[PDB]
Design an enzyme around this catalytic site. Structure first.
Site, PDB file in Angstrom:
ATOM      1  N   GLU A 292       0.943  -1.329   0.066  1.00 18.06           N
ATOM      2  CA  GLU A 292       0.073  -0.125  -0.105  1.00 18.06           C
ATOM      3  C   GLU A 292       0.959   1.164  -0.044  1.00 18.06           C
ATOM      4  O   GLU A 292       1.350   1.725   1.085  1.00 18.06           O
ATOM      5  CB  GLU A 292      -0.944   0.132   1.250  1.00 18.06           C
ATOM      6  CG  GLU A 292      -1.888  -1.276   1.177  1.00 18.06           C
ATOM      7  CD  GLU A 292      -2.884  -1.273   2.221  1.00 18.06           C
ATOM      8  OE1 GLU A 292      -3.051  -0.213   2.983  1.00 18.06           O
ATOM      9  OE2 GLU A 292      -3.444  -2.223   2.962  1.00 18.06           O
TER      10      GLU A 292
HETATM   11  C1  LIG Z   1      -7.100   2.491   0.783  1.00 18.45           C
HETATM   12  C2  LIG Z   1      -7.424   1.766   2.151  1.00 18.45           C
HETATM   13  O1  LIG Z   1      -7.230   0.705   2.246  1.00 18.45           O
HETATM   14  N1  LIG Z   1      -7.677   2.608   3.164  1.00 18.45           N
HETATM   15  C3  LIG Z   1      -6.903   3.686   3.661  1.00 18.45           C
HETATM   16  C4  LIG Z   1      -6.769   3.781   5.053  1.00 18.45           C
HETATM   17  O2  LIG Z   1      -6.077   2.295   5.246  1.00 18.45           O
HETATM   18  C5  LIG Z   1      -6.210   4.690   5.620  1.00 18.45           C
HETATM   19  O3  LIG Z   1      -6.391   4.913   7.361  1.00 18.45           O
HETATM   20  C6  LIG Z   1      -5.402   3.980   7.887  1.00 18.45           C
HETATM   21  O4  LIG Z   1      -6.017   2.573   7.912  1.00 18.45           O
HETATM   22  C7  LIG Z   1      -5.085   1.654   8.476  1.00 18.45           C
HETATM   23  C8  LIG Z   1      -5.754   0.338   8.153  1.00 18.45           C
HETATM   24  O5  LIG Z   1      -6.062   0.354   6.985  1.00 18.45           O
HETATM   25  C9  LIG Z   1      -4.740   1.997  10.035  1.00 18.45           C
HETATM   26  O6  LIG Z   1      -3.822   1.093  10.260  1.00 18.45           O
HETATM   27  C10 LIG Z   1      -4.165   3.513   9.957  1.00 18.45           C
HETATM   28  O7  LIG Z   1      -4.449   3.863  11.436  1.00 18.45           O
HETATM   29  C11 LIG Z   1      -5.338   4.569   9.412  1.00 18.45           C
HETATM   30  N2  LIG Z   1      -4.690   5.722   9.338  1.00 18.45           N
HETATM   31  C12 LIG Z   1      -5.027   6.868   9.415  1.00 18.45           C
HETATM   32  C13 LIG Z   1      -6.701   7.023   9.728  1.00 18.45           C
HETATM   33  O8  LIG Z   1      -4.654   8.099   9.192  1.00 18.45           O
HETATM   34  C14 LIG Z   1      -6.701   6.111   5.334  1.00 18.45           C
HETATM   35  C15 LIG Z   1      -5.847   7.341   5.937  1.00 18.45           C
HETATM   36  O9  LIG Z   1      -6.091   8.518   5.113  1.00 18.45           O
HETATM   37  O10 LIG Z   1      -6.604   6.429   3.723  1.00 18.45           O
HETATM   38  C16 LIG Z   1      -7.533   5.163   3.337  1.00 18.45           C
HETATM   39  O11 LIG Z   1      -7.575   5.401   1.781  1.00 18.45           O
END
Ligand SMILES: CC(=O)N[C@@H]1[C@@H](O)[C@H](O[C@@H]2O[C@H](CO)[C@@H](O)[C@H](O)[C@H]2NC(C)=O)[C@@H](CO)O[C@H]1O
Length: 540
Positions: A292
């Site tokens: 990712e």
């Molecule tokens: C594309 C996708 O799978 N989603 C992204 C999120 O994953 C991401 O948030 C983050 O998610 C993680 C688990 O998937 C967590 O470990 C992490 O804490 C979390 N981080 C954040 C909330 O900042 C967000 C962040 O903008 O993007 C999505 O697209």
């Protein structure tokens, strides 16, 4: 006359082909792969002639032979196949052989051949389905879910899956290599401890306690060599030999090392470590690459290169070549999969029409389209289509699928993602025509475990009563709940939107459905995934 009948001595009867050091925190020391288990047996002869040859039999077949030189004896030998054996000591002379009563011994190996099958009843609302549609039904199980979430492998509704993915296997590396881990308290340091003495860019285990040592149903005895998630997954394989159990490397916070694998020296080291991992942990059926993401825009704002698309294709090809070699060495089929972004902009950084020839399945992450990271642009986080109030919505399931198909990806490769959780905002306001998505938010919704994210179990259990509105957007194919007093707005998948995805998969001849994460379902989501793909009710 024939010798007296020997008595097998009391002693340890549990042995292991892959040994686990119970006082080690470094992965290099934690696990010792041997070609065979070192087995020992002793005996006493209380009545008669001790014979002149002593033998140790396993299921009647000699594993050891030596001169019988006294009333007691000890034999040390190797056993190279896991399982349970009826062991006997026989004392022989010219007049006959006299065999002890049998004592069972256990020779452990990481295929679970020593374990009773973990065949647990379905819990919560889960109902039994047969896997006869020919479609993928997948879900990710997270290693840390055994703590606060208390969701262990024995709670997985395993008969209702074709694919169980284990998140997540880390790639070793300290400063500059796993900086994304530093955002989680203690997590970077935990990886450095696991990887002590281990080269950068080899795989490891992030939480060896959870993965291998925590007592769990079916693996609670102190001398059970494999406990934790891996021990239970081995027993699960014994119950479900057709279930594909794949280790998933990466995810949101463990993806940073992929960005260095344009260096083939590092990439080669990684691929070789994956082969060694699969030779060590035999219950795994392949590997999932959850990078990712190629090109960046993941956890680390300082990583991402235009070279990443080429690196990805090379990685998949070299992983496939390693897996093909492992396959013919073992006689087993191994799978290569990857979890990928569903945004068209991200998809077009990679030539999936080429990479698909190396891959069994593409897990299209058609979720997290919207969430509390953006408080001004609200939308459905996992919808099939655009809503009526914004038909040009970029991030939808269909647009992700279409981006892949436009490259030339075969539809049967594409596994559509469903969400077992909601994302949401608080203080939504300034919306028009009773559509909360046209407003703006002041913050994240209060989460089950983390801000802005709600387990589907809790949505169904708490936010489908009282003041909460419920609306199914039939244009987008997406449910949402809204609390007007506080402006709490949650977007999620439910049984109907999952049904729309499953029907869409069948109509477009896609590969199936998968979810994240299995612990957050109450059964509704996985039930609908199975039903909508045409799986028959019942047990086969
Ligand atoms: C594309 C996708 O799978 N989603 C992204 C999120 O994953 C991401 O948030 C983050 O998610 C993680 C688990 O998937 C967590 O470990 C992490 O804490 C979390 N981080 C954040 C909330 O900042 C967000 C962040 O903008 O993007 C999505 O697209």
């Amino acid at each position: 006359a024939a010798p007296g009948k020997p008595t097998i001595a009391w002693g340890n009867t549990k042995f292991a082909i892959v040994e686990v050091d119970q006082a080690a925190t470094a992965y290099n020391n934690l696990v010792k792969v041997k070609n065979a288990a070192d087995v020992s047996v002793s005996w006493n002869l209380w009545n008669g002639d001790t014979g002149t040859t002593a033998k140790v039999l396993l299921n009647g077949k000699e594993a050891w032979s030596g001169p019988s030189t006294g009333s007691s004896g000890t034999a040390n030998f190797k056993v190279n196949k896991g399982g349970r054996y009826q062991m006997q000591v026989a004392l022989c002379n010219a007049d006959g052989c006299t065999a002890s009563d049998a004592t069972e011994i256990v020779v452990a190996d990481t295929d679970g051949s020593h374990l009773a099958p973990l065949k647990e009843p379905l819990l919560e609302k889960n109902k039994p389905y047969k896997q006869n549609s020919g479609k993928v039904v997948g879900s990710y199980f997270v290693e840390w879910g055994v703590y606060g979430r208390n969701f262990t492998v024995d709670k997985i509704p395993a008969q209702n899956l074709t694919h169980l993915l284990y998140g997540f296997i880390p790639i070793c590396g300290g400063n500059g290599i796993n900086d994304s881990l530093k955002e989680i308290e203690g997590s970077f340091q935990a990886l450095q401890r696991s990887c002590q003495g281990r080269e950068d860019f080899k795989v490891s285990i992030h939480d060896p306690f959870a993965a291998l040592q925590k007592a769990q149903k079916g693996v609670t005895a102190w001398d059970d060599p494999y406990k934790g998630n891996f021990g239970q997954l081995m027993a699960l394989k014994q119950a479900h030999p057709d279930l594909k159990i794949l280790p998933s490397i990466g995810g949101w916070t463990l993806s940073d090392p992929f960005f260095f694998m344009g260096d083939k020296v590092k990439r080669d080291r990684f691929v070789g470590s994956v082969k060694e991992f699969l030779q060590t942990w035999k219950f795994f059926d392949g590997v999932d690459i959850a990078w990712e993401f190629p090109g960046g825009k993941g956890a680390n704002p300082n990583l991402g290169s235009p070279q990443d698309g080429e690196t990805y294709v090379l990685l998949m090809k070299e992983l496939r070549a390693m897996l093909d070699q492992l396959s013919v060495e073992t006689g087993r089929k191994y799978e290569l999969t990857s979890a990928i972004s569903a945004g068209k902009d991200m998809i077009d950084k990679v030539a999936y029409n080429v990479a698909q020839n190396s891959m069994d399945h593409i897990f299209l992450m058609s979720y997290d389209f919207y969430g509390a990271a953006d408080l001004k642009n609200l939308g459905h986080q996992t919808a099939l289509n655009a809503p009526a109030w914004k038909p040009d919505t970029a991030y939808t399931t269909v647009n992700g699928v279409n981006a892949l198909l436009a490259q030339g990806v075969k539809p049967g490769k594409i596994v559509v993602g469903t969400a077992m959780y909601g994302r949401g905002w608080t203080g939504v306001n300034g919306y028009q025509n009773n559509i909360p998505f046209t407003g703006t938010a002041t913050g994240p919704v209060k989460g089950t475990w983390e801000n802005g994210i709600v387990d589907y179990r809790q949505i169904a259990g708490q936010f489908m009563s009282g003041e909460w509105q419920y609306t199914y957007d039939a244009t987008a194919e997406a449910p949402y709940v809204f609390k007007p007093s506080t402006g709490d707005l949650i977007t999620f998948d439910d049984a109907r939107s999952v049904q729309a995805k499953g029907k869409y998969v069948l109509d477009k001849q896609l590969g199936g459905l998968f979810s994240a994460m299995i612990d957050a379902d109450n059964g509704d989501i996985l039930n609908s995934m199975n039903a909508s793909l045409g799986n028959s009710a019942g047990v086969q």
